[PDB]
Amino acid sequence: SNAKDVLGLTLLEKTLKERLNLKDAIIVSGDSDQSPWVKKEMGRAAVACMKKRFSGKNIVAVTGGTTIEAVAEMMTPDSKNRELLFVPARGGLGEDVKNQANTICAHMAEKASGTYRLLFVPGQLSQGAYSSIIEEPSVKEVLNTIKSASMLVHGIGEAKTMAQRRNTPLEDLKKIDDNDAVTEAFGYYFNADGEVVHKVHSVGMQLDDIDAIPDIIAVAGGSSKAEAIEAYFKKPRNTVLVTDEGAAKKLLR
Amino acid sequence: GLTLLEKTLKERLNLKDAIIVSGDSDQSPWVKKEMGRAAVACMKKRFSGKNIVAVTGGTTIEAVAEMMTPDSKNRELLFVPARGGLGEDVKNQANTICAHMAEKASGTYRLLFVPGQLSQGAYSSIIEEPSVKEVLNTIKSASMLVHGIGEAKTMAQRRNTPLEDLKKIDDNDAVTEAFGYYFNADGEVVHKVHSVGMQLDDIDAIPDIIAVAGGSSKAEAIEAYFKKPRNTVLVTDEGAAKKLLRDE
């Protein structure tokens, strides 16, 4: 791309990909912490990536958060009219409704003119209530769909920001802090070496399941996320990263 | 004339107030948007410093959502659905309208996540669950209710009403519908859709109730619903009002 070349983004992407051992790196101009449109440009770039990687039939698992909402906002119908079913990767994770995976999932499916299936297994269910619900055909159906996800599109957050934004129980806050979590993705908090140190209990996709998903696209940016992004990628994730100059430049400094 | 028409409607229907926009929404589709615009203006006049706004679904309340804009006075706004989905398609569900309105208002919202067609056991589990209980509690403290009114048969058929309930609605001569209750010509409940959240008895405790409903086809439905005192502001159109009042 001449635009990427002239802006120095081609080199920056090469450097970031090598640094983080990524399947690929896509970087948009600017710092989303400073300029609101940059998050939309990350959404647009993520959508372009999804479309490049779709096959004939697709089960797309998604997380919540404002960045994947931006992906949904930028989504458009598939000009190839390939089959698209969208599911949340996991539960609500204690997010407010606007940021819940179910919310982003429905928004994305509508924008893509695809279909969706939502997961309603609240985290605060009693043991007895959980046993009743987990056996429901509708719940089993969605869990089964998630298990065959062909794509995962997920955000990455700072551990503290995510813990504060969700309604995290005191005991779990202590655990996140005591174990020096620095990054978060799909309801897992990780330390600076990319090791899991706290897991939000939630049905659906577990960390071990991502290895079986051929196309994983993480979308996360802003200078404030530089250390979070670095930590998450300390382990092999077989993942494409869509980010911005804010995060990428700070990370590479 | 419109001021006289409003005065007569308020009296005939025992309204808190009548707001009548021009035209007939059954003939001129865009009149629904003008009802929406007037309803939003009415809501903003009624807001207190803090607000919990319960809403129903349906295309008329979707028009309210569509015409919603942020509050110039920046009052606190939390939007909730009044009841469950009531068997509506997604575009007509209270949850959908609720989210749309809150986004347009730059407010916050909470939704009732109570799926069908769950077994009895799972259903009761879902409704006892802490997050759902929180939302139900919020609805119980609603300061405003914004709702539609529909013709009984029309609403029952649009929703996926079971044949046995269709028969009961017919046998009991239901003529009007609002927030999941079907009423006869005397404004008496004859059938209720089972659903968590707001009940009919709860509306008396809500200080500001705004009904938005119009079109000549709804004249009989609107008259029937208001046969009992509802302490409600009606936003409607000339189509409904002139027909109801025999002033065509």
Short mmCIF file of C-alpha atoms in Angstrom, two decimals:
data_model
loop_
_atom_site.label_atom_id
_atom_site.label_comp_id
_atom_site.label_asym_id
_atom_site.label_seq_id
_atom_site.Cartn_x
_atom_site.Cartn_y
_atom_site.Cartn_z
CA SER A 1 0.00 0.00 0.00
CA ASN A 2 1.41 3.41 -1.02
CA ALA A 3 -0.45 5.03 1.84
CA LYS A 4 1.08 2.62 4.37
CA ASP A 5 4.51 3.06 2.74
CA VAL A 6 4.49 6.86 2.80
CA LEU A 7 3.23 6.93 6.41
CA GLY A 8 5.93 4.44 7.54
CA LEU A 9 3.24 1.92 8.54
CA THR A 10 4.59 -0.86 6.28
CA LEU A 11 7.87 -0.91 8.20
CA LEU A 12 6.13 -0.48 11.54
CA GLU A 13 3.90 -3.51 10.81
CA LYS A 14 6.93 -5.61 9.79
CA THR A 15 8.75 -4.63 12.99
CA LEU A 16 5.71 -5.28 15.22
CA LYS A 17 4.97 -8.68 13.63
CA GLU A 18 8.56 -9.78 14.18
CA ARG A 19 8.66 -8.41 17.73
CA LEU A 20 5.44 -10.15 18.82
CA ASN A 21 5.72 -13.25 16.56
CA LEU A 22 2.32 -12.49 15.05
CA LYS A 23 0.64 -14.21 12.11
CA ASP A 24 0.37 -10.64 10.82
CA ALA A 25 0.20 -7.08 12.16
CA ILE A 26 -2.14 -4.39 10.84
CA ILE A 27 -1.56 -0.86 12.13
CA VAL A 28 -3.71 2.21 11.50
CA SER A 29 -2.51 5.76 11.93
CA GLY A 30 -2.80 7.62 15.20
CA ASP A 31 -3.50 7.01 18.87
CA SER A 32 -7.03 5.91 19.75
CA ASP A 33 -6.49 7.23 23.30
CA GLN A 34 -6.23 10.73 21.78
CA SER A 35 -8.32 10.60 18.56
CA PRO A 36 -11.78 8.89 18.61
CA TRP A 37 -11.84 8.11 14.86
CA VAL A 38 -8.74 5.88 15.17
CA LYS A 39 -10.79 3.19 16.95
CA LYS A 40 -13.23 3.25 14.02
CA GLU A 41 -10.27 2.79 11.63
CA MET A 42 -9.15 -0.24 13.68
CA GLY A 43 -12.75 -1.54 13.28
CA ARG A 44 -12.57 -1.01 9.51
CA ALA A 45 -9.18 -2.76 9.27
CA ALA A 46 -10.43 -5.71 11.37
CA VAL A 47 -13.50 -6.09 9.12
CA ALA A 48 -11.22 -6.13 6.03
CA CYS A 49 -9.16 -8.84 7.68
CA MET A 50 -12.26 -10.93 8.55
CA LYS A 51 -13.53 -10.72 4.97
CA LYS A 52 -10.13 -11.82 3.56
CA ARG A 53 -10.21 -14.89 5.84
CA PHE A 54 -13.88 -15.99 5.59
CA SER A 55 -14.46 -19.34 3.85
CA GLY A 56 -17.71 -20.74 2.40
CA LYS A 57 -19.21 -21.29 5.86
CA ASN A 58 -18.23 -19.39 8.99
CA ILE A 59 -18.94 -19.49 12.71
CA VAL A 60 -17.51 -16.27 14.09
CA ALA A 61 -17.00 -16.05 17.87
CA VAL A 62 -16.71 -12.50 19.23
CA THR A 63 -15.98 -10.78 22.52
CA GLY A 64 -17.50 -7.59 23.88
CA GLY A 65 -15.85 -4.25 24.67
CA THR A 66 -15.84 -0.92 22.83
CA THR A 67 -13.18 -1.99 20.29
CA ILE A 68 -15.12 -5.01 19.04
CA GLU A 69 -18.22 -2.77 19.06
CA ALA A 70 -16.22 -0.58 16.65
CA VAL A 71 -15.62 -3.68 14.46
CA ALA A 72 -19.39 -4.31 14.48
CA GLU A 73 -20.11 -0.68 13.60
CA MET A 74 -17.81 -0.94 10.60
CA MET A 75 -19.14 -4.32 9.42
CA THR A 76 -20.91 -4.57 6.03
CA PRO A 77 -22.58 -7.41 4.09
CA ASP A 78 -20.33 -9.94 2.39
CA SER A 79 -20.20 -9.28 -1.36
CA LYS A 80 -19.44 -13.00 -1.80
CA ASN A 81 -22.61 -13.88 0.19
CA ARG A 82 -20.77 -16.50 2.22
CA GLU A 83 -22.55 -18.11 5.17
CA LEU A 84 -22.05 -16.13 8.43
CA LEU A 85 -23.18 -17.17 11.92
CA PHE A 86 -22.03 -15.01 14.86
CA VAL A 87 -21.84 -16.19 18.49
CA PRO A 88 -20.38 -14.73 21.67
CA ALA A 89 -17.16 -16.54 22.67
CA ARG A 90 -18.16 -16.64 26.35
CA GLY A 91 -20.62 -15.10 28.86
CA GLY A 92 -21.29 -11.48 29.84
CA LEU A 93 -18.15 -11.48 32.07
CA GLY A 94 -19.67 -8.84 34.37
CA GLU A 95 -19.74 -6.12 31.68
CA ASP A 96 -22.56 -3.59 31.51
CA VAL A 97 -25.01 -4.51 28.75
CA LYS A 98 -23.53 -2.13 26.13
CA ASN A 99 -20.16 -3.92 26.38
CA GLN A 100 -21.40 -7.52 26.67
CA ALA A 101 -20.39 -10.11 24.06
CA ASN A 102 -24.09 -10.80 23.32
CA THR A 103 -24.59 -7.12 22.46
CA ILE A 104 -21.58 -6.85 20.11
CA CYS A 105 -22.51 -10.20 18.55
CA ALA A 106 -26.05 -9.08 17.63
CA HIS A 107 -24.78 -5.72 16.33
CA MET A 108 -22.14 -7.39 14.14
CA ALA A 109 -24.53 -9.99 12.74
CA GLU A 110 -27.09 -7.32 11.83
CA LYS A 111 -24.44 -5.20 10.05
CA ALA A 112 -23.07 -8.28 8.19
CA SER A 113 -26.58 -9.45 7.25
CA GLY A 114 -25.65 -12.76 8.91
CA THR A 115 -27.35 -14.72 11.66
CA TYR A 116 -26.53 -14.96 15.36
CA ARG A 117 -27.10 -17.11 18.45
CA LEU A 118 -26.76 -15.70 21.95
CA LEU A 119 -25.65 -17.32 25.21
CA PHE A 120 -27.70 -16.68 28.33
CA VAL A 121 -25.94 -18.36 31.25
CA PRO A 122 -25.44 -15.57 33.82
CA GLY A 123 -22.30 -15.71 36.02
CA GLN A 124 -24.28 -15.23 39.26
CA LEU A 125 -26.37 -18.41 38.88
CA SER A 126 -26.54 -20.60 41.99
CA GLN A 127 -25.12 -24.11 41.61
CA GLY A 128 -28.65 -25.54 41.44
CA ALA A 129 -29.82 -22.88 38.97
CA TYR A 130 -26.78 -23.52 36.75
CA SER A 131 -27.51 -27.26 36.64
CA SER A 132 -31.06 -26.52 35.43
CA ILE A 133 -29.95 -24.07 32.73
CA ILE A 134 -26.82 -25.81 31.39
CA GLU A 135 -28.98 -28.79 30.31
CA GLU A 136 -31.41 -26.72 28.25
CA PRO A 137 -31.35 -27.64 24.53
CA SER A 138 -30.99 -23.95 23.55
CA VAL A 139 -27.91 -23.56 25.76
CA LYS A 140 -26.38 -26.83 24.60
CA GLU A 141 -26.96 -25.73 21.00
CA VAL A 142 -25.08 -22.42 21.37
CA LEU A 143 -22.26 -24.03 23.35
CA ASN A 144 -21.92 -26.62 20.57
CA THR A 145 -21.80 -23.83 17.94
CA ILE A 146 -19.07 -22.01 19.85
CA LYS A 147 -17.08 -25.26 19.98
CA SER A 148 -16.87 -25.23 16.17
CA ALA A 149 -15.92 -21.56 15.81
CA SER A 150 -13.96 -20.97 12.58
CA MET A 151 -12.95 -17.44 13.60
CA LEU A 152 -12.44 -15.51 16.85
CA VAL A 153 -12.42 -11.71 17.01
CA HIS A 154 -11.41 -10.43 20.42
CA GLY A 155 -10.20 -7.33 22.29
CA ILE A 156 -7.29 -7.03 24.70
CA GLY A 157 -7.47 -4.79 27.79
CA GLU A 158 -5.32 -3.61 30.69
CA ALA A 159 -6.02 -5.88 33.65
CA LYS A 160 -6.84 -3.02 36.03
CA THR A 161 -9.12 -1.20 33.55
CA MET A 162 -11.08 -4.37 32.84
CA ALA A 163 -11.35 -5.42 36.48
CA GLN A 164 -12.67 -1.93 37.37
CA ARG A 165 -15.12 -1.77 34.44
CA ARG A 166 -16.68 -5.18 35.21
CA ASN A 167 -18.33 -5.58 38.59
CA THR A 168 -15.45 -7.68 39.93
CA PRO A 169 -15.92 -9.26 43.42
CA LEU A 170 -13.40 -8.05 46.02
CA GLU A 171 -11.77 -11.49 46.39
CA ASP A 172 -11.07 -11.58 42.66
CA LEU A 173 -9.67 -8.04 42.67
CA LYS A 174 -7.26 -9.19 45.36
CA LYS A 175 -6.24 -12.22 43.28
CA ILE A 176 -5.68 -10.13 40.13
CA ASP A 177 -3.54 -7.73 42.13
CA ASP A 178 -1.62 -10.29 44.25
CA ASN A 179 -0.60 -12.14 41.04
CA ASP A 180 0.39 -8.97 39.15
CA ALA A 181 -2.00 -9.35 36.20
CA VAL A 182 -1.26 -6.76 33.50
CA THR A 183 -3.44 -7.81 30.55
CA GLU A 184 -6.84 -9.37 29.86
CA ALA A 185 -8.54 -11.11 26.93
CA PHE A 186 -11.89 -12.99 26.79
CA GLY A 187 -12.24 -13.26 30.59
CA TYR A 188 -8.67 -14.34 31.32
CA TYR A 189 -6.20 -12.12 33.19
CA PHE A 190 -2.51 -12.70 32.44
CA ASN A 191 0.77 -11.57 33.94
CA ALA A 192 3.70 -9.93 32.11
CA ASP A 193 4.92 -13.31 30.81
CA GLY A 194 1.51 -14.09 29.27
CA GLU A 195 0.65 -16.72 31.96
CA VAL A 196 -2.95 -16.99 33.17
CA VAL A 197 -3.26 -15.77 36.75
CA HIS A 198 -7.05 -15.36 37.04
CA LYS A 199 -9.91 -16.79 35.00
CA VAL A 200 -13.45 -15.39 35.07
CA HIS A 201 -15.63 -18.51 35.29
CA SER A 202 -17.94 -18.56 32.26
CA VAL A 203 -19.27 -21.21 29.91
CA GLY A 204 -18.30 -21.33 26.25
CA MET A 205 -14.84 -20.89 24.82
CA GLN A 206 -11.95 -21.67 27.14
CA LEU A 207 -8.31 -20.64 26.55
CA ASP A 208 -7.37 -24.15 25.41
CA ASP A 209 -10.04 -23.96 22.70
CA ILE A 210 -8.35 -21.12 20.80
CA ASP A 211 -5.67 -23.48 19.46
CA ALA A 212 -8.41 -25.11 17.31
CA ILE A 213 -9.65 -21.83 15.75
CA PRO A 214 -7.79 -21.26 12.47
CA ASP A 215 -8.35 -17.49 12.21
CA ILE A 216 -7.95 -15.35 15.34
CA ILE A 217 -8.01 -11.54 15.02
CA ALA A 218 -7.22 -9.43 18.13
CA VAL A 219 -8.25 -5.78 17.88
CA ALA A 220 -6.71 -3.44 20.50
CA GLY A 221 -4.96 -0.07 20.46
CA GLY A 222 -4.08 3.14 22.25
CA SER A 223 -0.81 3.99 23.96
CA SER A 224 -2.35 2.94 27.31
CA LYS A 225 -2.57 -0.67 26.02
CA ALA A 226 1.07 -1.01 24.93
CA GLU A 227 2.22 -3.15 27.92
CA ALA A 228 -1.06 -5.17 27.88
CA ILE A 229 -0.63 -6.07 24.20
CA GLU A 230 3.03 -6.99 24.73
CA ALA A 231 2.21 -9.26 27.72
CA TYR A 232 -0.66 -11.06 25.96
CA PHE A 233 1.63 -11.90 23.01
CA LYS A 234 4.43 -13.27 25.26
CA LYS A 235 3.03 -16.75 24.46
CA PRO A 236 2.29 -18.14 20.99
CA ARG A 237 -1.30 -17.20 20.07
CA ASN A 238 -1.38 -17.89 16.30
CA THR A 239 -3.13 -14.49 15.99
CA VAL A 240 -3.43 -11.45 13.69
CA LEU A 241 -3.21 -8.14 15.58
CA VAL A 242 -5.04 -5.00 14.42
CA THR A 243 -3.76 -2.03 16.39
CA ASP A 244 -2.76 1.65 16.00
CA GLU A 245 0.43 3.73 16.09
CA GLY A 246 -0.34 4.75 19.67
CA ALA A 247 0.13 1.21 20.96
CA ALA A 248 2.65 -0.04 18.35
CA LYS A 249 5.11 2.86 18.70
CA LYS A 250 4.99 2.82 22.49
CA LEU A 251 5.55 -0.95 22.51
CA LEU A 252 8.48 -0.78 20.09
CA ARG A 253 10.17 2.13 21.90
CA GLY B 1 -59.92 23.09 15.73
CA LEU B 2 -56.79 21.50 17.25
CA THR B 3 -56.79 23.31 20.64
CA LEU B 4 -60.53 22.59 20.98
CA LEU B 5 -59.92 19.05 19.72
CA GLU B 6 -57.30 18.50 22.42
CA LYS B 7 -59.58 19.94 25.10
CA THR B 8 -62.42 17.61 24.03
CA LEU B 9 -60.16 14.55 23.86
CA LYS B 10 -58.69 15.22 27.32
CA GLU B 11 -62.23 15.42 28.71
CA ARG B 12 -63.66 12.45 26.80
CA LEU B 13 -60.76 10.14 27.73
CA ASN B 14 -59.97 11.59 31.20
CA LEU B 15 -56.38 12.27 30.14
CA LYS B 16 -53.73 14.08 32.13
CA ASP B 17 -53.21 15.87 28.76
CA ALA B 18 -53.80 15.35 25.03
CA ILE B 19 -51.16 16.16 22.39
CA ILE B 20 -52.55 15.86 18.86
CA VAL B 21 -50.30 16.07 15.80
CA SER B 22 -51.68 16.81 12.31
CA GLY B 23 -52.83 14.15 9.82
CA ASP B 24 -53.66 10.43 9.88
CA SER B 25 -50.69 8.05 10.37
CA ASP B 26 -52.68 5.26 8.63
CA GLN B 27 -52.72 7.40 5.45
CA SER B 28 -49.53 9.44 5.81
CA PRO B 29 -46.86 7.10 7.22
CA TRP B 30 -44.49 9.92 8.25
CA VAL B 31 -47.12 11.12 10.79
CA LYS B 32 -45.85 8.35 13.08
CA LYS B 33 -42.51 10.26 13.14
CA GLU B 34 -44.34 13.47 14.07
CA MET B 35 -46.02 11.62 16.97
CA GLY B 36 -42.50 10.43 17.89
CA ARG B 37 -41.13 13.99 17.82
CA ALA B 38 -43.98 15.35 20.03
CA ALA B 39 -43.62 12.44 22.49
CA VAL B 40 -39.88 13.09 22.91
CA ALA B 41 -40.63 16.79 23.59
CA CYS B 42 -43.25 15.73 26.17
CA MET B 43 -40.82 13.35 27.90
CA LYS B 44 -38.23 16.12 28.24
CA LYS B 45 -40.83 18.43 29.90
CA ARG B 46 -41.56 15.73 32.49
CA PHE B 47 -38.02 14.64 33.40
CA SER B 48 -36.86 15.19 36.96
CA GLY B 49 -33.19 15.41 37.97
CA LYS B 50 -33.03 11.60 37.82
CA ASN B 51 -35.19 9.29 35.75
CA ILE B 52 -36.00 5.67 35.24
CA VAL B 53 -37.90 5.36 31.98
CA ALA B 54 -39.79 2.14 31.22
CA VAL B 55 -40.71 1.58 27.58
CA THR B 56 -42.72 -0.87 25.49
CA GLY B 57 -41.98 -2.11 21.99
CA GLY B 58 -44.00 -1.69 18.82
CA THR B 59 -43.44 0.57 15.80
CA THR B 60 -44.86 3.71 17.41
CA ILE B 61 -42.46 3.59 20.34
CA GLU B 62 -39.69 2.75 17.85
CA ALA B 63 -40.61 6.12 16.22
CA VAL B 64 -40.18 7.80 19.62
CA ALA B 65 -36.74 6.16 19.86
CA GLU B 66 -35.88 7.30 16.33
CA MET B 67 -36.76 10.94 17.13
CA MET B 68 -35.03 10.88 20.52
CA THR B 69 -32.14 13.32 21.05
CA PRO B 70 -29.95 14.12 24.10
CA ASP B 71 -31.49 16.17 26.93
CA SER B 72 -30.30 19.80 26.70
CA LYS B 73 -30.68 19.96 30.51
CA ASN B 74 -28.46 16.85 30.94
CA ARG B 75 -30.75 15.10 33.43
CA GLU B 76 -29.86 11.52 34.50
CA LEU B 77 -31.61 8.92 32.28
CA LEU B 78 -31.85 5.14 32.72
CA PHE B 79 -34.06 3.27 30.27
CA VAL B 80 -35.59 -0.17 30.88
CA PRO B 81 -38.15 -2.33 29.05
CA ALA B 82 -41.47 -2.37 30.98
CA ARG B 83 -42.01 -6.13 30.46
CA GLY B 84 -40.58 -9.13 28.51
CA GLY B 85 -40.63 -9.66 24.73
CA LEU B 86 -44.37 -10.52 24.63
CA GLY B 87 -43.86 -12.70 21.55
CA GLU B 88 -42.86 -9.79 19.28
CA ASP B 89 -40.23 -10.09 16.54
CA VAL B 90 -36.86 -8.53 17.38
CA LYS B 91 -37.62 -5.15 15.75
CA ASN B 92 -40.78 -4.78 17.90
CA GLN B 93 -39.39 -6.07 21.20
CA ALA B 94 -39.23 -3.72 24.19
CA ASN B 95 -35.53 -4.64 24.65
CA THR B 96 -34.71 -3.40 21.14
CA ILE B 97 -36.64 -0.12 21.50
CA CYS B 98 -35.12 0.38 24.98
CA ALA B 99 -31.54 0.12 23.70
CA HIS B 100 -32.32 2.32 20.67
CA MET B 101 -33.91 5.05 22.79
CA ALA B 102 -31.09 5.08 25.37
CA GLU B 103 -28.42 5.35 22.64
CA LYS B 104 -30.27 8.26 20.99
CA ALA B 105 -30.71 9.98 24.37
CA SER B 106 -27.09 9.42 25.41
CA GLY B 107 -28.50 7.64 28.50
CA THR B 108 -27.87 4.26 30.10
CA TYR B 109 -30.05 1.15 29.86
CA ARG B 110 -30.66 -2.32 31.29
CA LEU B 111 -32.40 -5.20 29.53
CA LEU B 112 -34.55 -8.14 30.60
CA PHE B 113 -32.84 -11.26 29.34
CA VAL B 114 -35.48 -13.95 29.74
CA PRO B 115 -35.33 -16.34 26.75
CA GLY B 116 -37.99 -18.58 25.26
CA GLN B 117 -38.93 -21.32 24.95
CA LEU B 118 -37.27 -22.51 28.17
CA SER B 119 -38.52 -25.38 30.32
CA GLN B 120 -40.38 -24.36 33.49
CA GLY B 121 -37.38 -25.20 35.70
CA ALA B 122 -34.87 -23.17 33.66
CA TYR B 123 -37.32 -20.29 33.28
CA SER B 124 -37.78 -19.95 37.07
CA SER B 125 -33.99 -20.19 37.49
CA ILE B 126 -33.36 -17.36 35.01
CA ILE B 127 -35.91 -15.07 36.70
CA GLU B 128 -34.56 -15.64 40.26
CA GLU B 129 -31.02 -14.85 39.11
CA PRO B 130 -29.36 -11.73 40.64
CA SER B 131 -28.90 -9.67 37.43
CA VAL B 132 -32.50 -10.24 36.34
CA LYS B 133 -33.79 -9.39 39.82
CA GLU B 134 -31.80 -6.12 39.66
CA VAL B 135 -33.56 -5.16 36.44
CA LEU B 136 -36.99 -6.10 37.79
CA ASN B 137 -36.29 -3.91 40.84
CA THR B 138 -35.32 -1.02 38.54
CA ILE B 139 -38.58 -1.36 36.58
CA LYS B 140 -40.50 -1.35 39.88
CA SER B 141 -39.02 2.11 40.56
CA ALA B 142 -39.82 3.54 37.11
CA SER B 143 -40.56 7.30 37.18
CA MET B 144 -41.94 7.30 33.59
CA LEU B 145 -43.66 4.83 31.33
CA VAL B 146 -43.81 5.30 27.55
CA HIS B 147 -46.16 2.82 25.88
CA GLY B 148 -48.14 2.04 22.74
CA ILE B 149 -51.78 1.06 22.34
CA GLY B 150 -52.88 -1.45 19.70
CA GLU B 151 -55.99 -3.11 18.33
CA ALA B 152 -56.43 -6.46 20.15
CA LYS B 153 -56.69 -8.74 17.11
CA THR B 154 -53.84 -6.91 15.33
CA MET B 155 -51.43 -7.22 18.26
CA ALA B 156 -52.38 -10.83 19.02
CA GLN B 157 -51.78 -11.90 15.41
CA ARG B 158 -48.47 -10.00 15.02
CA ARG B 159 -47.16 -11.73 18.14
CA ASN B 160 -47.09 -15.51 17.96
CA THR B 161 -50.10 -15.93 20.16
CA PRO B 162 -51.05 -19.60 20.75
CA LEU B 163 -54.37 -20.60 19.16
CA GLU B 164 -55.94 -21.20 22.58
CA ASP B 165 -55.15 -17.62 23.65
CA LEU B 166 -56.38 -16.24 20.33
CA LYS B 167 -59.69 -17.97 21.01
CA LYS B 168 -59.89 -16.51 24.53
CA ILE B 169 -59.06 -13.00 23.28
CA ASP B 170 -61.85 -13.40 20.65
CA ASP B 171 -64.38 -15.04 23.05
CA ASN B 172 -63.88 -12.25 25.57
CA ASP B 173 -64.39 -9.51 22.95
CA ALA B 174 -61.01 -7.85 23.52
CA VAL B 175 -60.75 -4.65 21.50
CA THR B 176 -57.53 -3.00 22.69
CA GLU B 177 -54.07 -3.90 23.94
CA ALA B 178 -51.28 -2.23 25.92
CA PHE B 179 -48.09 -3.55 27.51
CA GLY B 180 -49.20 -7.18 27.14
CA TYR B 181 -52.73 -6.81 28.50
CA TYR B 182 -55.84 -7.19 26.34
CA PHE B 183 -58.94 -5.17 27.36
CA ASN B 184 -62.63 -5.21 26.35
CA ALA B 185 -64.73 -2.17 25.34
CA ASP B 186 -65.18 -1.15 29.01
CA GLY B 187 -61.39 -1.08 29.52
CA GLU B 188 -61.41 -4.25 31.67
CA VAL B 189 -58.57 -6.78 31.42
CA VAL B 190 -59.77 -9.96 29.71
CA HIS B 191 -56.39 -11.61 28.95
CA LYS B 192 -52.82 -11.01 30.04
CA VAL B 193 -49.62 -12.18 28.43
CA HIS B 194 -47.55 -13.89 31.13
CA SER B 195 -44.28 -11.93 31.43
CA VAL B 196 -42.05 -10.62 34.22
CA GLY B 197 -41.72 -6.90 35.01
CA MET B 198 -44.38 -4.21 35.20
CA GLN B 199 -47.96 -5.27 35.97
CA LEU B 200 -51.10 -3.23 35.34
CA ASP B 201 -51.46 -2.48 39.07
CA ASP B 202 -47.95 -0.94 39.02
CA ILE B 203 -48.83 1.92 36.63
CA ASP B 204 -50.66 3.93 39.33
CA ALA B 205 -47.35 4.47 41.13
CA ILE B 206 -45.64 5.87 38.00
CA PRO B 207 -45.85 9.72 38.01
CA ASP B 208 -45.57 10.24 34.24
CA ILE B 209 -47.24 7.88 31.78
CA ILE B 210 -47.14 8.82 28.11
CA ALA B 211 -49.15 6.78 25.60
CA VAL B 212 -48.23 7.21 21.97
CA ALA B 213 -50.75 5.84 19.49
CA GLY B 214 -52.56 7.15 16.45
CA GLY B 215 -54.15 6.48 13.07
CA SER B 216 -57.85 6.20 12.29
CA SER B 217 -57.64 2.37 12.65
CA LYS B 218 -56.90 2.74 16.42
CA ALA B 219 -59.77 5.08 17.34
CA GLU B 220 -61.84 2.29 18.96
CA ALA B 221 -58.80 0.75 20.71
CA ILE B 222 -57.77 4.09 22.18
CA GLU B 223 -61.28 4.90 23.41
CA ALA B 224 -61.62 1.47 25.07
CA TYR B 225 -58.24 1.62 26.80
CA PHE B 226 -59.09 5.00 28.32
CA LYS B 227 -62.54 3.90 29.57
CA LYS B 228 -60.85 3.53 32.98
CA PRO B 229 -58.87 6.44 34.51
CA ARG B 230 -55.21 5.95 33.56
CA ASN B 231 -53.75 9.34 34.66
CA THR B 232 -51.98 9.30 31.28
CA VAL B 233 -50.78 11.82 28.67
CA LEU B 234 -51.87 10.72 25.17
CA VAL B 235 -49.81 11.63 22.16
CA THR B 236 -51.94 10.89 19.11
CA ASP B 237 -52.91 12.24 15.66
CA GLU B 238 -55.97 13.82 14.00
CA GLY B 239 -56.68 10.48 12.32
CA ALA B 240 -57.41 8.80 15.66
CA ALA B 241 -58.76 11.85 17.53
CA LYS B 242 -61.24 13.10 14.94
CA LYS B 243 -62.62 9.57 14.39
CA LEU B 244 -62.94 8.89 18.13
CA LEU B 245 -64.64 12.26 18.73
CA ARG B 246 -66.83 12.03 15.59
CA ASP B 247 -65.35 15.30 14.32
CA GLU B 248 -64.34 14.17 10.82
#
